[PDB]
Amino acid sequence: MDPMIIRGIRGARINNEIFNLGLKFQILNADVVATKKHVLHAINQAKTKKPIAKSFWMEILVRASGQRQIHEAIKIIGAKDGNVCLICEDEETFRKIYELIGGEIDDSVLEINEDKERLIREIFKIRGFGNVVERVLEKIALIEL
RNA sequence: GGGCCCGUAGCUCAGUCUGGCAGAGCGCCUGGCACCAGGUGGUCGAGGGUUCAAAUCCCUUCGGGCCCGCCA
């Protein structure tokens, strides 16, 4: 319907309130997202693949974690008081939550550096050589296995 | 993370509950006139345990498939 809007924001203090407002959005840990392609592929899996979660936006989070467990996904790639990736379909929705966490918007916060690569490879159990994001998508694609 | 089913002849699978000679159909070989008769079939996924006796029960494990919970 609406085009997905994805923008990372640097230095955000997360308030658990935002999850009790019934707003169509998803917020991730920017420091563990391979790139904008990571989130896009997760949304693709959420849109198409067989549901694991009772919500589409929750389905994004679990697909981003590369595994079925819902609570593990919240820990693996859930937003943690800092660099985050806000995901919306309504501009007003994005504006609302940003007012509740703050932080200068910086899409580079979703770009990957060597320290982020070590973190992602350790987190996503990426044991081996090969382009990090390529095998991040590969791990997400086979959640249905 | 939790729960369930399959694995047995070359193939499809019964048999497992309730331990008691390893079975059917299918094909395969032979002979006879597609059909008839004779013949042919086993690392029971693996290991270990229990037992006089295990495909069968217990533990463990490999391979294939299915379901579920977690919903900041």
Residue numbers in the entry: 3 to 147
Lines quoted from the article behind this entry:
The KEOPS complex, which is conserved across archaea and eukaryotes, is composed of four core subunits; Pcc1, Kae1, Bud32 and Cgi121. Kae1 catalyzes the universal and essential tRNA modification N6-threonylcarbamoyl adenosine, but the precise roles of all other KEOPS subunits remain an enigma. Here we show using structure-guided studies that Cgi121 recruits tRNA to KEOPS by binding to its 3’ CCA tail. A composite model of KEOPS bound to tRNA reveals that all KEOPS subunits form an extended tRNA-binding surface that we have validated in vitro and in vivo to mediate the interaction with the tRNA substrate and its modification.
Overall, mjCgi121 engaged the tRNA in a manner that sterically caps its free 5′ and 3′ termini. mjCgi121 contacts the tRNA through an extensive surface (1162 Å2) involving helices-α1, -α3, and -α4, in agreement with the NMR analysis. Contacts with the tRNA are directed largely at the universal 3′ CCA tail (C74, C75, and A76), and to a lesser degree at G73. The mjCgi121–tRNA interface involves a mixture of hydrophobic, hydrogen-bonding and salt interactions. The base of A76 engages a deep hydrophobic pocket formed by Gly80 and the side chains of Phe21, Met60, and Ile76. The ribose 3′ hydroxyl group of A76 is tightly packed against Cgi121, which may disfavor the binding of aminoacylated tRNAs. The base of C75 forms hydrophobic contacts with the side chains of Lys56, Met60, and Ile72. The base of C74 forms hydrophobic contacts with the Ile72 side chain, and a hydrogen-bond with the peptide backbone of Ile72. In conclusion, these crystallographic analyses revealed a binding mode of mjCgi121 to tRNA that is counter-intuitively directed at a universal element of tRNAs that is maximally distant (>65 Å) from the A37 site of t6A modification.
